[PDB]
């Protein structure tokens, strides 16, 4: 019954939840359902959320196991054609929801836009196998996914408290979920732990990789580290997976002559 469902997880968000919801309620040209999944805030959050138009607004307020648990509860209740997730410190830009509706009209399963972070565009990557040796290719809050996308991919993996968004998108890529990237800003707003989860997520695509080899690939694609061992890694594991060969030749087009050699002998 709704073009869009916006899932907003909140805990102690009294400072910004107003600005967040104003960015959703003011969206013109769409029927929007809002599901606020609050983890039991003791501050003004519940009152502020209640100060908005409640017509299509549901409030869940109960303990949960973290951000992605709250997101899962909201996604599970969503009735909209496309489902977005907005943090309480985030805002959608004007007209974004209508842009999502328009770009979804042919049945694409994911519609993703750009993200503005401290006045700079997030350095996004393409939605393609090459993302599988990296992080999430677009900002998770700039992503909208259909009911069928979530039905087919499933829910967010709570084992990942940082990078569950990346792991979900990688599962989408591996499931050949369709995606359309829109070159418009949709949303504005312990490294060792982040790196550990990101390596783990990459290894869930390619279980033959050592953690250090997942790290090398990740730093390689992101431009944080050198790439002279990429060909070595390709020769080491190319026989394991055509997807992995495809990912490396997409991420590092210069290894094409070596990639074709892997394809030719094993795939
Ligand atoms: N329901 C729920 N929401 C949370 C929890 N922790 C954080 N949040 C909310 O999740 C959103 C993002 O949290 P934040 O600390 O900014 O993490 P980040 O934006 O993903 O880096 C905000 O809307 C918070 O209110 C939690 O344990 N439960």
From TrEMBL:
Keyword field contains Transferase: yes
Domain of life, source organism: Bacteria
Domain Glycosyltransferase 2-like, chain residue ranges per copy: 5-116
UniProt keyword list: Transferase
Gene3D superfamilies recorded: Spore Coat Polysaccharide Biosynthesis Protein SpsA, Chain A
Coiled-coil region list: none
Record-level Gene Ontology MF annotations: hexosyltransferase activity
Name of the protein in question: Glycosyltransferase
């Amino acid at each position: 019954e709704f073009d869009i469902t916006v899932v907003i997880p909140t805990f102690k968000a009294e400072k910004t939840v107003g600005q967040c919801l104003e960015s959703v309620l003011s969206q013109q040209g769409v029927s929007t359902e809002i599901i606020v999944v609050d983890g039991g805030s003791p501050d003004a959050t519940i009152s502020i959320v209640q100060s908005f138009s409640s017509t299509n607004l549901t409030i869940i307020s109960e303990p949960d196991r973290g951000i992605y648990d709250a997101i899962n509860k909201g996604v599970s209740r969503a009735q909209g054609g496309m489902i977005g997730v907005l943090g309480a410190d985030d805002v959608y830009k004007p007209n974004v929801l209508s842009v999502v509706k328009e770009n979804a009209s042919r049945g694409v399963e994911i519609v993703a836009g750009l993200t503005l972070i401290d006045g700079q565009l997030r350095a996004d990557e393409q939605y393609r196998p090459a993302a599988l040796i990296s992080g999430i290719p677009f900002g998770h809050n700039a992503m909208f996914a259909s009911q069928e996308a979530y039905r087919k991919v499933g829910l967010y993996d709570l084992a990942y408290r940082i990078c569950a968004d990346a792991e979900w998108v990688h599962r989408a890529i591996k499931s050949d979920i369709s995606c359309r990237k829109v070159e418009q800003v949709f949303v504005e707003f312990n490294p060792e732990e982040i790196i550990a989860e990101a390596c783990s997520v990459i290894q869930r695509n390619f279980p033959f990789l050592l953690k250090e080899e997942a790290k090398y690939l990740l730093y390689g694609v992101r431009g944080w580290g050198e790439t002279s061992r990429i060909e070595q890694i390709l020769r080491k594991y190319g026989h394991e997976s055509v997807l992995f060969v495809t990912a490396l030749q997409e991420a590092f087009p210069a290894v094409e002559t070596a990639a074709a050699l892997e394809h030719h002998h094993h795939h």
